[PDB]
């Protein structure tokens, strides 16, 4: 769809991205006002459907994520939603165009705490076909 | 479309929001997200707010759909607040494939009383 003329440059030089290109505290934000027990279920069910809302706590940057290849209901592969790689938590991959630059959101979340670590990656491959 | 500002994305514009506003009070204007490049009608759009203090402010009617490049929000409303005059960064998600995300920093300050 729409991107700035020089994505990598923007991704590497701007504070918004840099402050987001290194593993930092992330936290699920779905059903914010509800019993933690339920939220935990919501999170996993949503993860199995390939979607979630995870905000970067430090900056309050909220993101709605889709765990599917940028290309494109249908269960996500273990590449975008991994429940094994590490018992207790789930590793997530989510492509998107953020502020005009193709990126990939990667991170994991503790199925118990519903908090975790994640960051943004420049998606070279996607960026060039745009 | 009313008064508009650029978002941090080169593909979207959104309405100008009050610099400061009261918690749970209707906005002086209908919040609008305008898409520059083609975006099919029906495409879902959502708004989310946060900052260092309140990482994910509660919102009302923060979902809308495109109709001729414009996603008009019906009584969007900021319930959560920003606190110690620190304002919200809006996250606008346009659900194309993959989703397109546009941020609007220091878009609005939400306190309990307002101006």
Structure description:
Chain A has 4 helices and 7 strands; from the N terminus they run H-H-E-H-E-E-E-E-E-E-H. Chain A has 130 residues and is α+β, with helices and mostly antiparallel strands. Chain A has one domain (1-130): Core binding factor, beta subunit (Polyomavirus Enhancer Binding Protein 2, Chain: A). Chain A has a 7-stranded antiparallel β-sheet with strand order 3-2-1-7-6-5-4. The longest helix of chain A has 13 residues, at 36-48. Chain B is mainly β. In chain B, 0% of the residues lie in helices and 43% in strands. Chain B contains no helices and 11 strands. Chain B has strands at 4-6, 12-15, 20-22, 32-35, 44-50, 59-60, 63-65, 70-72, 77-78, 88-94, 100-111. In chain B, strand 1 and strand 2 form a beta hairpin. Chain B starts with a strand and ends with a strand. Classes of the chains: A alpha+beta (130), B mainly beta (115). Chain A binds chain B through residues 1-4, 16, 27, 29, 32-33, 53, 55-66, 68, 70-72, 94-100, 126, and chain B through 7-11, 36-37, 39, 46, 48-56, 58, 88-89, 91, 93, 95-103. Strand 5 of chain A pairs parallel with strand 11 (100-111) of chain B, so a sheet runs across the interface. The PDB classes it as transcription. Keywords: transcription factor, transcription. The assembly is dimeric. The entry is titled "AML1/CBFbeta complex".
